[PDB]
Amino acid sequence: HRWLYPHPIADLEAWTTANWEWFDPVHSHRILWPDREYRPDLDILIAGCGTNQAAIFAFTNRAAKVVAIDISRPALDHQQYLKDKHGLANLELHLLPIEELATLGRDFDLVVSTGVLHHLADPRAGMKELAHCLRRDGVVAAMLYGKYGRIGVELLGSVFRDLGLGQDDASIKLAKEAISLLPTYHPLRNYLTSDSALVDTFLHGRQRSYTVEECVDLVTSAGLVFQGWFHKAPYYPHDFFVPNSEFYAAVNTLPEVKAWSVMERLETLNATHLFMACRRDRPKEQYTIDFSTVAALDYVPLMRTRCGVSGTDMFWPGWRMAPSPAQLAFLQQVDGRRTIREIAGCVARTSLADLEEFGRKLFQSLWRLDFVAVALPA
Amino acid sequence: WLYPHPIADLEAWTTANWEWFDPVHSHRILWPDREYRPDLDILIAGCGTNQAAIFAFTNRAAKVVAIDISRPALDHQQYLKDKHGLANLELHLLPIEELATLGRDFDLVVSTGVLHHLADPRAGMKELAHCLRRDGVVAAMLYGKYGRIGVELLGSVFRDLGLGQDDASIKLAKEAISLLPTYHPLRNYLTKARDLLSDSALVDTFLHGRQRSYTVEECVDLVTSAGLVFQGWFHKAPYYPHDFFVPNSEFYAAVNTLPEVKAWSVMERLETLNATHLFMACRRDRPKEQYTIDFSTVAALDYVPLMRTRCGVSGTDMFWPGWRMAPSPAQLAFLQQVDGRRTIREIAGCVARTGGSLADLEEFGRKLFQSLWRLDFVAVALPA
Ligand SMILES: Nc1ncnc2c1ncn2[C@@H]1O[C@H](CSCC[C@H](N)C(=O)O)[C@@H](O)[C@H]1O
Ligand SMILES: Nc1ncnc2c1ncn2[C@@H]1O[C@H](CSCC[C@H](N)C(=O)O)[C@@H](O)[C@H]1O
């Protein structure tokens, strides 16, 4: 490690008005725990916090107790800098490998381990230790690299290792020239469209990548349940953009895991698996999202972070479009309080069975596209 | 669904198209040290519908023996045999595993797109080796790992959806291909696969189980495991840095520093459109002087450059199949002296009698013809 990765953040007041952490409960509480309001007083473990992550969580959740572990002293030294600068009294730092988490003698409501577990000798033993740190209703939020999104990186990485390249300036120069000489069609060009991030990606040894089924098997091997994805978009047919496709109908017939497995092989830009795991003894009503049954009509749709409606447009982060007038009518009634049944009711005052059906299908489609989350009954 | 697509008429097909490993076209690549021989003994090991008939049609004085496990495939070779009077074509329903029953060896053994379909590809290559004369060549094609990513991705999806060879599966398969995002690895492959959406070729690629693909190192190991020498590539372009288009690249210099096989292995991972390994294998006891091409030695000055099929010079342009460009004036001067008779030394001599001493021009000639040999523009004739 020639430079610190990730790149150290100087000021969280600047960073947090512009950016956000995926698994920050301030933003993502309803995705982790669909059945409850934001809780400001969570016990949060950041397992492999690197330079910035734990300090961000402690800054945005001032009343939360944040415990952070890393094996890197320089990484923890930057968390300490951010701790001292911003008075993060709620942040506790340890030089500790994931393997020794039991030495903390604590369990947690949220365990975040993003971009860490592959660097372990035994990723399965790592996930087992995260599982043992989890309260009944707690969630492990994890990131692994995805096999089919990382093809380009693995190709160039392996070439750089066969040429004996390291982290020196001469190796970085050769590495950039190689990337500049890639033909237009090389798989790495799609991935590309930061000397520290270049070194971490290309010149820091092979980084294990995972299929959907390997992610699920890692989670179940640790005695945990695969709760689901942070971003659903990569893992489902986008039937909202392409309705009435017989091929997408045949994919939506398969059991969830086999269906995700198919879409990973058709949607190959996505290069990370962001997923949630929880305990077998967490009641399934807390987190089970199933738009196929009558219970879905009690789901309360809410706009996800940086999503919503502006006039006749619906927006995601960095993408806008005009839905059909009949679709917009449903989206205008999303307030984070009304149920799908209630929303169909409000549209009907502008059959009921047909509108409830259209509502259920629409919110299913937009949940799979990361436009709405759902609040489940308490 | 016969694959490959049956050809109706070889008189029409052969004026427009050609087989890579047809000795009429490619004799100097298989045997650099000798002229075309019209009377070769040729084995087509897994001939499919067309290939053996084409070889027999273009080499009328050659004895062509063809084997396949598919009766319908051999039935089309027979149709072509009867239509064109290919008395020099002998057909057998015989697996490669039972080749020894024919009790014959051959000057040329062609096995293109066949060996992966075997239970034991290495036992297949061993049986081809056992039927090869001292100076004979095995011309083989295996699918390449990094060029076939797209095919393997969609193939595996179709198997997980339980799709077969029925009309309903072919319709779903075409719709799936239409729904692939622009960046899907299969899309670049589809741009160069002219005939792949035809029902026969679609089924063969996507709906008839996984076809094993190979890295450069797996091809070389398959050949050496059978007790053969890896002679080289039919097309060198995929396996070398294109220093003719990008001279003085420090990265390409570092790749050209590696041992040959590791260097080929690197270029396979940088040049990922190429989806087939077309290579030649020969016996360890074939004299190395017959086929060894090494532009780094003084012997290279005695190499006779020859234009490869559908390559040459018209005025100030040089052409490949499907690509034209203007070389530097000093490059053109060398290319205008390629006649398939003059050596690299002689060519430098002719340029010198028209920006360099003799030593400098011989050096420029050696480097230029090395660059263009690696780009499949010139073959070389070696001394007898
Ligand atoms: N066994 C182990 N236990 C804990 N941390 C580890 C570890 N092996 C590697 N790490 C750390 O894991 C981190 C991965 S980099 C990712 C940092 C942070 N999770 C983020 O999302 O920004 C590095 O800081 C590395 O030092
Ligand atoms: N064990 C075996 N021995 C001989 N042929 C075999 C075989 N297994 C498969 N084949 C045949 O190999 C062929 C591969 S298709 C390629 C056809 C031809 N070589 C060409 O290049 O156009 C098929 O016809 C298939 O039936």
Residue numbers in the entry:
A (entry chain A): 16 to 208, 215 to 371, 378 to 405
B (entry chain B): 18 to 371, 376 to 405
Text of the article:
It secretes methyltransferase (MTase) Rv2067c into macrophages, trimethylating histone H3K79 in a non-nucleosomal context.
To understand the structural differences conferring the context-dependent methylation of H3K79 by DOT1L and Rv2067c, and the basis of free H3 methylation by Rv2067c, we determined the structure of Rv2067c to 2.40 Å resolution. Each monomer (407 aa) of Rv2067c homodimer (Source Data and Supplementary Software File 1) is composed of three domains: N-terminal SAM-binding catalytic domain (CD), dimerization domain (DD), and C-terminal domain (CTD). The catalytic domain contains a central seven-stranded β-sheet flanked by α-helices, a characteristic of seven-β-strand (7BS) MTases (class-I MTases)35. CTD is about 100 residues long with α + β architecture. The dimerization interface, in conjunction with the other two domains, forms two parallel trough-like structures across the dimer, which constitute the acceptor substrate-binding trough. Inspection of the Rv2067c substrate-binding trough revealed that the residues facing the methyl moiety of SAM (SAM-facing residues) occlude the H3K79 binding. In addition to the active site dynamics, the dα3-dα4 loop (residues 209–214, part of LSD and the substrate-binding trough) near the active site is disordered, as evident from the missing electron density in the crystal structure and relatively high root mean square fluctuations observed from simulations (Source Data and Supplementary Software File 3). In short, due to the lack of nucleosome interacting structural appendages and different active site architecture, Rv2067c is incompetent to methylate nucleosomal H3K79, but its substrate-binding trough could accomodate free H3 for methylation.
